[PDB]
Amino acid sequence: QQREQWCSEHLDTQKELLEEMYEEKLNILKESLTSFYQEEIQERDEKIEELEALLQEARQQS
Amino acid sequence: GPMVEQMQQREQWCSEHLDTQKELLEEMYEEKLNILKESLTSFYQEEIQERDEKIEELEALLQEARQQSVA
């Protein structure tokens, strides 16, 4: 009985700390990619705004 | 003596399991990383594509509007 539960306690602690180490890695990746992609999304949103305004004008043009 | 040996045997037995867990956890992280890269890419690609297609549609609505204004 006691071997399993003595080791398993160090196994629990190791897993918790390694899961934290890896979760930070995953977050750094998640944040870096999303900042890159939100920049690309923003550049496109600004072009959509420009084109929309031009359209406002062309319809009002006649 | 043998009491020391029983202790060293228990310690090594556990050490080997901690090593195996360490390697298994890294594989689980690699898979979770793969899933996350794939989810984030696929999501932002769809968003980029959708916006690219709006730019093209707006460009064709603009040309149409200007054709009707000239006419």
Residue numbers in the entry:
A (entry chain B): 601 to 662
B (entry chain A): 594 to 664
Describing publication, verbatim:
Aurora B localization and activation throughout mitosis and cytokinesis depend on three other proteins: INCENP, survivin, and borealin.
Progressive deletion of the C terminus of MKLP2 showed that once amino acids C-terminal to position 650 are removed, Aurora B is released from this mutant MKLP2 trap. Further fine truncation mapping defines a region close to amino acid 640–660 that is necessary to trap the CPC. Mutation or deletion of these three elements showed that only the first acidic patch of amino acids 636–652 was essential for interaction of the CPC with MKLP2 in anaphase. The minimal binding region of MKLP2557-668 exists in two species with molecular masses of 25.4 and 63.7 kD (yellow traces), consistent with a dimeric and a higher order oligomeric species.
